[PDB]
From a paper:
Dystrophin is a cytoskeletal protein belonging to the spectrin superfamily and is responsible for linking the extracellular matrix (ECM)-binding dystroglycan complex to the cortical actin cytoskeleton. Actin binding by dystrophin is mediated by two portions of the protein: the tandem calponin homology (CH) actin-binding domain 1 (ABD1, residues 1–246) and a series of spectrin repeats (SR) in the middle of the protein comprised of SR11–SR17 and referred to as actin-binding domain 2 (ABD2; residues Phe1461–Gln2209). The ABD1 of dystrophin is a member of the calponin homology domain superfamily. CH domains are found in a range of actin-binding proteins and consist of approximately 100 amino-acid residues with a characteristic α-helical fold that includes a core three-helix bundle and two flanking helices.
The structure of the N-terminal actin-binding domain of human dystrophin was determined at 1.94 Å resolution. Each chain in the asymmetric unit exists in a ‘closed’ conformation, with the first and second calponin homology (CH) domains directly interacting via a 2500.6 Å2 interface. The positioning of the individual CH domains is comparable to the domain-swapped dimer seen in previous human dystrophin and utrophin actin-binding domain 1 structures. The CH1 domain is highly similar to the actin-bound utrophin structure and structural homology suggests that the ‘closed’ single-chain conformation opens during actin binding to mitigate steric clashes between CH2 and actin. There were four protein molecules in the asymmetric unit. Based on the refinement statistics, the closed-conformation AlphaFold2-derived molecular-replacement model was used for further refinement. This choice was supported by the presence of inter-chain 2Fo − Fc electron density for the linker region connecting CH1 and CH2 in all chains of the asymmetric unit. The structural model shows density for peptide backbone residues 13–244, with most residues exhibiting resolved density for side chains. In domain-swapped dystrophin and utrophin dimers, the linker Gln134–Asn137 in dystrophin forms a helix that is extended away from the CH1 and CH2 domains. In the closed conformation, the helix melts and the linker forms a turn.
Author numbering: 13 to 244
Amino acid sequence: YEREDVQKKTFTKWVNAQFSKFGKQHIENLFSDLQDGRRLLDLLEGLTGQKLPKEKGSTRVHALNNVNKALRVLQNNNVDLVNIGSTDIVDGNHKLTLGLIWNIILHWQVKNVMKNIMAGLQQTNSEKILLSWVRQSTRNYPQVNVINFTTSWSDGLALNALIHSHRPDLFDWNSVVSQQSATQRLEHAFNIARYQLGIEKLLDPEDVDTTYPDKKSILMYITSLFQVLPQQ
């Protein structure tokens, strides 16, 4: 349940969702389009709201300066970072590029989205509180019993139940239960979240309806849902 090709795809979809939020250009390849250090600075500009000027020049030292600026901003935001140096990003290291993007997603999409609730509940484990939120929210949906952020989501019922429990107005639950295809249920939830909740479709059905669902991708998407669903 730690799947790196799926992570490449879904993390890139999240990065481009941020860029869509700010009207900037999308990236096409996560292991090439971050090397010059510019688009990382664009992403951190969008996330921090601060201007992060780029170095001028097309040599390796300018990319290294850009990435050093990005890493200094991350450390200034108390971000939990992987063991990384600027050269690892400039030179296209796959695992550490994925790991930096995951550090960013976890800091902003997960921890920061959930920070006020966690300070209220006086809890620190983000996964425990998010799992409890899903479980309590879907307690009265009988086809749903979420115990993890992987296989509990594969048949598409838990996602539709999480959406429905916070917005019972959007659809009739029995219409989803009557869908025998987990692909149709997953697409149904994805389309609701995309067009009625403003969440980019970070996940494909095959990223969830699969033998080993990627835990980080699902956690990312579920915390984005937590970010936009009403919890009055």
